[PDB]
Amino acid sequence: MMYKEPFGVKVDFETGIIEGAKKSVRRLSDMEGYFVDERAWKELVEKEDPVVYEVYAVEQEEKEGDLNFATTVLYPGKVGKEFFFTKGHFHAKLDRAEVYVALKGKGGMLLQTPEGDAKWISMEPGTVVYVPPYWAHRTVNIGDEPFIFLAIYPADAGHDYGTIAEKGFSKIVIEENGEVKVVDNPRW
Amino acid sequence: MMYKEPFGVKVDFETGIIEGAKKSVRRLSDMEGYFVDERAWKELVEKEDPVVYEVYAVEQEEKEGDLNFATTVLYPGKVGKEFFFTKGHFHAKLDRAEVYVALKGKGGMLLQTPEGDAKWISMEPGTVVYVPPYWAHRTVNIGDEPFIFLAIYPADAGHDYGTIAEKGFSKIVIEENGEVKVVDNPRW
Ligand SMILES: O=P(O)(O)OC[C@H]1O[C@H](O)[C@@H](O)[C@@H](O)[C@@H]1O
Ligand SMILES: O=P(O)(O)OC[C@H]1O[C@H](O)[C@@H](O)[C@@H](O)[C@@H]1O
Ligand SMILES: [Zn+2]
Numbered sequence: 007m008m009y010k011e012p013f014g015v016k017v018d019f020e021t022g023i024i025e026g027a028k029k030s031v032r033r034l035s036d037m038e039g040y041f042v043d044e045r046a047w048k049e050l051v052e053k054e055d056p057v058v059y060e061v062y063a064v065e066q067e068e069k070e071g072d073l074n075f076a077t078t079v080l081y082p083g084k085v086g087k088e089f090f091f092t093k094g095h096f097h098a099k100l101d102r103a104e105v106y107v108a109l110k111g112k113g114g115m116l117l118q119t120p121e122g123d124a125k126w127i128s129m130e131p132g133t134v135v136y137v138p139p140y141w142a143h144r145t146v147n148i149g150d151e152p153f154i155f156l157a158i159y160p161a162d163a164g165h166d167y168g169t170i171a172e173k174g175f176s177k178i179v180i181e182e183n184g185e186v187k188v189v190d191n192p193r194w
Numbered sequence: 195m196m197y198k199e200p201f202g203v204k205v206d207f208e209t210g211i212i213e214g215a216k217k218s219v220r221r222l223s224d225m226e227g228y229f230v231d232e233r234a235w236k237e238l239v240e241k242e243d244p245v246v247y248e249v250y251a252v253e254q255e256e257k258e259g260d261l262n263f264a265t266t267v268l269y270p271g272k273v274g275k276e277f278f279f280t281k282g283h284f285h286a287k288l289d290r291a292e293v294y295v296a297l298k299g300k301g302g303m304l305l306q307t308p309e310g311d312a313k314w315i316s317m318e319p320g321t322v323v324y325v326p327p328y329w330a331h332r333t334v335n336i337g338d339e340p341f342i343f344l345a346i347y348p349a350d351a352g353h354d355y356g357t358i359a360e361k362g363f364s365k366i367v368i369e370e371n372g373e374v375k376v377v378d379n380p381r382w
């Protein structure tokens with residue numbers, strides 16, 4: 007049969023960049039209906055519309071058994087009191103797991119089941135996070151530099167953004183009184 | 195509904211130790227029939243029997259879509275001219291891919307199709323290697339310090355050592371005249 011070519015790519019642990027990879031950029035304007043404070047959101051899009059995160063993805067065709075990988079560069083910032091985060095998604099094939107390796111910066115992961123039960127996992131450089139089957143997953147930057155990580159996921163996992171885009175996560179991550187707090191989402 | 199609990203674990207990029215993982219140790223004596231220089235193997239076993247590699251594995255049940263991960267510490271050394279390496283394997287489910295992230299030291303990966311078509315990929319810290327479906331894979335330490343890396347693989351991939359145990363790879367990685375060479379395996 008035909009076999010695909012093995013390859014190596016260099017990942018820059020300082021920047022998160024993978025040369026030759028498919029780069030995506032999410033600005034604040036790409037994230038309407040995501041943050042609790044919509045007026046803060048609106049003002050920030052009008053003033054500056056900052057980059058929230060960059061993704062450098064190395065993807066295969068969607069086949070059982072195969073693997074994708076991507077780095078994400080999550081910029082530091084808040085919308086109101088709420089730290090910058092990734093959109094978050096379930097997988098289209100719902101039982102697909104995921105593995106994240108934290109490389110630089112300070113943050114964590116919010117995860118939740120289709121029932122809506124949430125989990126928070128702190129991430130520092132060297133933290134490996136196991137995302138099990140069925141858990142939606144979103145990363146949050148709670149520090150003052152880019153939070154940079156590498157994610158490895160099944161090529162056929164796909165992305166299911168819709169549920170999260172409408173209702174969000176049952177927990178939010180905010181700064182209150184000079185302190186990082188994981189608290190119930192008011193809008194849940 | 196049964197949902198597995200997400201977790202995070204600290205991986206020390208300087209040691210490759212994962213606390214709480216299933217630890218495997220492979221000494222040179224566990225690697226009979228793997229090295230070209232059989233007399234040099236037997237002598238090093240009698241004189242020292244060093245640890246060739248240690249694995250720290252975090253494994254799930256063998257389920258489609260789920261993921262395992264493991265770090266490996268491949269110690270520096272040669273049997274004759276041939277650098278220390280992992281046993282190497284195809285996956286039991288052949289079409290399963292793997293992703294490796296190099297963390298410390300200097301090394302590389304030898305890859306091979308069921309037809310014996312071979313490939314060599316250099317690995318240095320920050321190198322990410324894509325191991326495609328159907329390729330057997332073996333890591334090699336070409337330096338004087340430990341070669342440390344993380345691997346993420348499908349939970350139902352399995353391991354097939356047999357073919358590699360008896361026949362080996364079609365290429366070998368040796369030190370000849372002060373330089374690293376990937377050359378034809380003379381025993382192939
Ligand atoms: O939830 P989002 O916006 O897809 O961001 C998450 C992104 O980061 C990670 O690198 C991976 O999980 C990607 O699959 C994903 O695209
Ligand atoms: O199994 P081998 O060839 O001895 O290599 C040692 C280990 O290296 C990597 O960490 C992974 O691919 C493991 O699945 C493997 O067991
Ligand atoms: Zn995912």
Ligand SMILES: [Zn+2]
Nearest residue numbers: 283285292347
């Ligand atoms: Zn493997």
